[PDB]
Amino acid sequence: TSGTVLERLVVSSLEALESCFAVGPIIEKERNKNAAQELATLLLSLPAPASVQQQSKSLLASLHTSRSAYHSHKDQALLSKAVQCLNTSSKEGKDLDPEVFQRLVITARSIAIMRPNNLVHFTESKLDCCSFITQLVNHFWKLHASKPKNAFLAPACLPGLTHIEATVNALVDIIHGYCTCELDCINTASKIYMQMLLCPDPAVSFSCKQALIRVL
Amino acid sequence: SNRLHMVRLMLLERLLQTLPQLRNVGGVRAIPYMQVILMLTTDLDGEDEKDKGALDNLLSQLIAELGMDKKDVSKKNERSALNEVHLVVMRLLSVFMSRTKSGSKSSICESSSLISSATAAALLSSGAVDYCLHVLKSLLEYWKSQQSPPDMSPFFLRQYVKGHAADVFEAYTQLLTEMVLRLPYQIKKITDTNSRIPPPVFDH
Amino acid sequence: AGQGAGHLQLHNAAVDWLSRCKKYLSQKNVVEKLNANVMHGKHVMILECTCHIMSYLADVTNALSQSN
Amino acid sequence: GCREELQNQANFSFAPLVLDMLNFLMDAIQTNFQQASAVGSSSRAQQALSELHTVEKAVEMTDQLMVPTLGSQEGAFENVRMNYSGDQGQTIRQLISAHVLRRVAMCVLSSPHGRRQHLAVSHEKGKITVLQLSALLKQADSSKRKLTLTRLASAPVPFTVLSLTGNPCKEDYLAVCGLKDCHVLTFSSSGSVSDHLVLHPQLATGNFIIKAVWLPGSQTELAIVTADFVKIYDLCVDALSPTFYFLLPSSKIRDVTFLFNEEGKNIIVIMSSAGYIYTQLMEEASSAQQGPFYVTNVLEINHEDLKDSNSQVAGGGVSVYYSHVLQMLFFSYCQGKSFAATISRTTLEVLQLFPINIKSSNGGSKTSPALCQWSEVMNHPGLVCCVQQTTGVPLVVMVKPDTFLIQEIKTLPAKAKIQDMVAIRHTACNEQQRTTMILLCEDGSLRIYMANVENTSYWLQPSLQPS
């Protein structure tokens, strides 16, 4: 491990947690399970190198005897963080950073890939239906508008999106999974779909089209 | 696969309300709108009553969007965005016509595409032959006076795209003429193959 | 060596050792020095020493967990 | 062989101990983990640019920013010095003595998205030679190896060359400017001439072409600026009637730059020989369809050094240049004072002003030489290159958010007076992004210099660049 010192310490601490929960008596395991899983879900939530995420998710999977409940807790934790950050950003009107945007996009894409049922159940649960869809499409459109028309005109920093096709494909797979599970807000999705289809940029309209072909 | 089936049926019925907003978008800006419909019609099993309502309903709205009864045909020669949306919608109808349901080893000639038969019946009911004649009369004077791009398939061949990447729509008149001479041939042959459909009337 | 009898003793040492190492990284001066992000000092060396001792803890627990 | 004994010994759980260090090491674990990867790079870059906009800066001299690596021999290029043989040669001599015009004898065809690395060099005999720099750029050794330059192609131009400018948006187009004519060459992938067209400025008597500038982020649009007027053409439709025609009611035209507002429409800034700065919003009202438009607005910059004497600001200006990457306008005056203005994109008013007091290495010269021919290295933000109006010494300036790192590029021996300047960022044999700076002197010798990564890669750090 050539990474940072604190990162190595965290890897060692989590493998020590594996040591305790694979060697120790059952009593201490069931006492410490609550704190261990809370800390694991935390460290999973905040950004960190991939290795500690992998070992923390292995820890949390080993903690739970049933895979479904483990994945459900992981889903509710990460999706709750996503919901709260998106809601705060929308309410304050600030411009969401492209990095956190792509992190949220890839996490939502993975959740839709594995369990769209649970993804719909949580993201549509009451903490108008499919308001999540409206707000994420709005965020996408503000970010795309903020992107300069010419990349040459852009300064050293690049506002707006960078990998347009990946983002639009992830968004459309999200919408398709939600349509497969949920049916009432489809009348909304159509509109946003069509808004994605009449866009002047070919790299988004054609990307959404081919994504519809590959998914449907 | 059922849930996906109603997903496509609803999506098809949603897109049908938003067809007419494509009047001012531009032809080059509107092909994927029908490219998605092409897949939306892939597993288009005619036997279902809700399905066939959806079919004839969509046929009716594309027919109405074409507006075959206006007979005000002197504006089709010039290049206008609404003309190009007409051109792409009739190209979509042509692709629907060319879609043939590959039957089994049965010797019955009635195993034609249900979508194709429905399109032909709707077009004959709306009377596209009259529009063909009027637009040909309109373009006769024009003809006598004349003397990495994205994947555009199947509406335009990729060779055509690579040869005319500046504008696939420069030869608007030639494409319109090809469409309007090609469609009557197909409706005539499909009506000939179907005994139930009476042959269309043709004069001198 | 052999069946692994030494792990019965060395791990015990590790049991206090990292705790001993803990008794060095919990001080306010040490955590302040860590917050300053300085490579030189005993704090960084001792945190690598930790990393190593329960790395050995990992080395024994993985074998014992695969002993099923 | 002691699994039960091991479990009995481990009955004392370390999980409480594990959590009771983890809880209070989280204070720095969180910080390092958030610092890890490209997280926060966008925010760091935004705060760096904001403090660049706001924080006042002072000028310091240095030499470690730029490091020479290779030096070509004398006579490697033929007839580099222009003897100005011709009817217009004497006029060009008078203009260069007056320093109104500066001759740019070379250019580079290369774009951030393209693969080209071509170098075009102009001769006195009306010929421009296009050359491949792949071997030159890939040679990083600082030995005395003989340079090997592969002549891609050459093309004879029927009029004298005063400036060569490659289109920054696309490497394909190259504009050649002289005293009275303009040419546009579209080059093939091998450097050969694929297309050749001639622009017709319809110059009036007594006026000379200053330079042709491509509109930033715009391909087929070229603005030819002369001593009296500016004509903006779009090659995509018309090469005879310009889309825009801008004139100046009083005094002569010195330099012209362009920017874009918050909406995105372009704005032209013209600084004149009278020292007044003027701005114009180009649109249908100011388009050449309605005729020539005289520029009337005057920028209000109030500084103790900037004194309006005899209807002249510091005895007149020298050059003007707006940095698209830095969102700020450079300018300088005949008296030798240089200023950097951060200007509002909606009110077009200078929000902040930064002086650039250039101090020479020797204390004999008190006043700073005038600055002209600003040049910004593509894909290398913050690094700009200028030349002196009176002496012609290159000066490389890095606009640090808090400071101004200036360096004079002096070549040993000093017999080779540097004629022209260029600097390209490219890739290395070890796929490392390196900035190589090519100097051409009057003797035809080439000087190869290299941008210190520990000194010239502040904005290029991963902590400031998105992944």
Q: Could you write out the DSSP letters of every residue in A168-210?
A: HHHHHHHHHHHHHH--TTHHHHHHHHHHHHS-S-HHHHHHHHH
Is any Cβ of chain A less than 8 angstroms from the Cβ of D25? yes
- Both tokens of B67, joined, read 């507006």
D255 Cβ neighbours under 8 A, 6+ residues apart: D210, D225, D270, D271, D317, D318, D319, D320, D321, D372
- Both tokens of B160, joined, read 């055509």
- D58 bridge partner residues: D403
D446 Cβ neighbours under 8 A, 6+ residues apart: D71, D72, D76, D77, D147, D438, D439, D440
A158 Cβ neighbours under 8 A, 6+ residues apart: A98, A147, A148, A151, D466
- Backbone φ and ψ for C11, nearest 5 degrees, come out as -55, -45
Interface test with D, best of A100, A153, A161 (most D CBs within 10 A): A153
D383 Cβ neighbours under 8 A, 6+ residues apart: D376, D377, D396, D397, D398, D423, D435, D451, D456
The size of chain D, in residues, is: 467
Q: How many Å apart are CA D220 and CA D170, to the nearest integer?
A: 10
Q: How many Å apart are CA D424 and CA D376, to the nearest integer?
A: 9
Q: How many CA atoms lie within 13 A of D338 on its CB side?
A: 27
Element at D67 (helix H, strand E): strand D66-71
Q: How many Å apart are CA B129 and CA B120, to the nearest integer?
A: 12
Is any Cβ of chain D less than 8 angstroms from the Cβ of C30? no
Closest CA to D13 of C22, A24, A35, A63: A24
CA distances from B200 to A101, B99, B190 (A): 60, 22, 11
Is any Cβ of chain A less than 8 angstroms from the Cβ of D148? no
For strands D209-214 and D221-226, give the pairing: antiparallel
Q: How many CB pairs under 8 A join A and C?
A: 39
- D322 bridge partner residues: D329
D11: distance to nearest CA of chain A, Å?
6
Closest CA to D167 of D185, D153, D190: D185
> Taking a C-beta distance cutoff of 8 angstroms, is the pair D442, D419 a contact?
yes
> Taking a C-beta distance cutoff of 8 angstroms, is the pair A204, B29 a contact?
no
Element at D329 (helix H, strand E): strand D328-333
Touch test A–C: 3 Cβ pairs or more under 8 Å: yes
D63 Cβ neighbours under 8 A, 6+ residues apart: D407, D408
| Annotated resolution, angstroms | 3.1
**D111: nearest CA partner in chain A:** A152
Is C35's CB within 8 Å of D24's CB?
no
**A7: nearest CA partner in chain C:** C51
**Using CB atoms, which residue from D17, D24, D28 is nearest to C19?**
D17
Closest CA to D129 of D176, D64, D74, D71: D176
- Backbone φ and ψ for D465, nearest 5 degrees, come out as -115, 130
Q: How many Å apart are CA C30 and CA D127, to the nearest integer?
A: 71
For strands D446-451 and D433-441, give the pairing: antiparallel
How many other CB atoms are there within 10 angstroms of residue D337's CB atom? 23
Closest CA to D175 of D218, D211, D151, D138: D211
Q: How many Å apart are CA B142 and CA B164, to the nearest integer?
A: 23
Is any Cβ of chain D less than 8 angstroms from the Cβ of C36? no
> Taking a C-beta distance cutoff of 8 angstroms, is the pair A21, A62 a contact?
yes
For strands D163-166 and D193-199, give the pairing: unpaired
Is C8's CB within 8 Å of D2's CB?
yes
> Taking a C-beta distance cutoff of 8 angstroms, is the pair D80, D443 a contact?
yes
How many other CB atoms are there within 10 angstroms of residue D364's CB atom? 6
Per CB-CB distance under 8 Å, the chain D contacts of A9 are 25, 29
Is A198's CB within 8 Å of B29's CB?
yes
Is B11's CB within 8 Å of A187's CB?
no
- Measured distance between the N- and C-terminal CA atoms of chain D, rounded to whole angstroms: 51
> Taking a C-beta distance cutoff of 8 angstroms, is the pair D130, D187 a contact?
yes
**B4: nearest CA partner in chain A:** A180
Say if residue D394 is exposed, middle or buried (CB neighbours under 10 Å; 0-12, 13-18, 19+). buried
Is A16's CB within 8 Å of C51's CB?
no
**Cis peptide upstream of residue B154 (ω within 30 degrees of 0):** yes
Is any Cβ of chain D less than 8 angstroms from the Cβ of C58? no
How many other CB atoms are there within 10 angstroms of residue A18's CB atom? 19
Is C8's CB within 8 Å of D9's CB?
yes
Q: How many Å apart are CA A91 and CA A88, to the nearest integer?
A: 5
- Both tokens of D349, joined, read 């008013």
Q: How many Å apart are CA D195 and CA D370, to the nearest integer?
A: 38
A190: distance to nearest CA of chain B, Å?
6
Q: How many Å apart are CA D110 and CA A44, to the nearest integer?
A: 44
**Using CB atoms, which residue from B4, B35, B150 is nearest to A216?**
B4
**A154: nearest CA partner in chain D:** D325
How many other CB atoms are there within 10 angstroms of residue D328's CB atom? 21
Long-range contacts of D282-290 (CB under 8 A, 24+ apart): D282/D232, D282/D244, D286/D244, D286/D246, D287/D243, D287/D244, D288/D231, D288/D232, D288/D241, D288/D242, D288/D243, D288/D244, D288/D245, D289/D243
Is any Cβ of chain A less than 8 angstroms from the Cβ of C55? yes
Cα-only R_g, chain B: 18
- Backbone φ and ψ for D58, nearest 5 degrees, come out as -120, 155
Chain-centre distance of CA C59, in angstroms?
12
**Using CB atoms, which residue from C19, C25, C67 is nearest to D3?**
C67
Per CB-CB distance under 8 Å, the chain D contacts of A99 are 38-42, 466-467
- Both tokens of B85, joined, read 């949306």
A54: distance to nearest CA of chain C, Å?
16
**Using CB atoms, which residue from D1, D9, D24 is nearest to C12?**
D9
A145 in the Ramachandran plot: left (φ > 0), alpha (ψ -120 to 50) or beta?
A: alpha
> CA quadruple D430, D431, D437, D439: dihedral positive or negative?
positive
- Residues preceding gaps in chain D (C to N > 2.5 Å): none
Q: How many Å apart are CA A140 and CA A96, to the nearest integer?
A: 10
- Both tokens of A207, joined, read 């990307």
Is any Cβ of chain B less than 8 angstroms from the Cβ of A183? yes
Element at B145 (helix H, strand E): helix B128-146
Q: How many Å apart are CA A44 and CA A33, to the nearest integer?
A: 16
Q: How many Å apart are CA D242 and CA B112, to the nearest integer?
A: 61
Say if residue B35 is exposed, middle or buried (CB neighbours under 10 Å; 0-12, 13-18, 19+). buried
Element at A33 (helix H, strand E): helix A26-45
Residue A147 DSSP code: S
Cα-only R_g, chain D: 26
Residue D287 DSSP code: B
> Taking a C-beta distance cutoff of 8 angstroms, is the pair D209, D178 a contact?
yes
- Both tokens of D90, joined, read 């004497």
Query: Amino acid identity, residue B68?
Result: M
> Taking a C-beta distance cutoff of 8 angstroms, is the pair D246, D295 a contact?
yes
**D28: nearest CA partner in chain C:** C35
For strands D150-156 and D163-166, give the pairing: unpaired
For strands D58-61 and D403-408, give the pairing: parallel
Alpha helices in D145-272 (DSSP H): none
Q: Using CB atoms, list chains with 3+ pairs below 8 Å to chain B.
A: A
Say if residue D57 is exposed, middle or buried (CB neighbours under 10 Å; 0-12, 13-18, 19+). middle
Is any Cβ of chain C less than 8 angstroms from the Cβ of D16? no
Interface test with A, best of D32, D214, D219, D261 (most A CBs within 10 A): D32
